[PDB]
Write a structure and sequence with these properties.
Elements: H1 13-16, E1 29-30, E2 36-37, E3 44-47, E4 53-58, E5 63-67, E6 75-78, E7 85-94, E8 105-106, E9 113-121, H2 127-130, E10 137-146, H3 151-158, E11 169-171, E12 187-192, E13 203-208, E14 212-214, H4 216-222, E15 253-255
The chain binds zinc ion.
PDB class: lyase
Keywords: lyase, protein engineering, CO2 capture
Assembly: monomeric
Amino acid sequence: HWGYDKHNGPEHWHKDFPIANGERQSPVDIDTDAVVQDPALKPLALDYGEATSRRMVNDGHSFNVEYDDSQDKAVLKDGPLTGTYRLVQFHFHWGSSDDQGSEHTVDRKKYAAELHLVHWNTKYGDFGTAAQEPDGLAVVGVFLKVGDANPALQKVLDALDSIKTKGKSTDFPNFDPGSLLPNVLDYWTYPGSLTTPPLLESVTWIVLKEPISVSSQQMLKFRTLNFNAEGEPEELMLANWRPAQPLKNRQVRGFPK
Ligand SMILES: [Zn+2]
């Protein structure tokens, strides 16, 4: 088992998951001075118009909104990518107070939470196959910046009472993941990993420059979830972010700049 406390948190994961100290781990700090433009980069092409949400699940480390990835209803193309990537799920990371919780940082600045929209490359057939390949996954990272209430986010938060403990799920149809995107789609990109065990090095990271908003009040609702299953002792889901990992050999690129 793994988690986010002093003893089982990120600093210890390397013992059970050696790849934690590897060459393309995420998240990273994005130093905007070192960011470079690249004329090969394209605008991000998100097509979430037919996206079909199925359910919401507490997986014991976070909560996921699952999408129907059996066809091309919710696809991600272009940006830094070649091919088509299907949306399989999104989930969030957040911290114990509003001044922390994002996984990526910008010139060391942290936000209150971060949304990850996970996509797999269709040339690999399924998520499991895709997850093992360097070009297999694409994750769009969206910062949640504390400020005004976010009404799109509120629909997600209203279901959280129904999935308090590990393993619970609730049906969650009709949620549009495009409603949790900012209006401008400028992004930073770098080759990285999943930010949770097994920490697979299979992700092209697409971190959006513009955050979406969230209220302090709304942030308290994230923190009502439990890491523990029902019947075990309570362990509140107050914080589930991995800190910045060393950039090592990698280049962060920016679009449009
Ligand atoms: Zn994540």
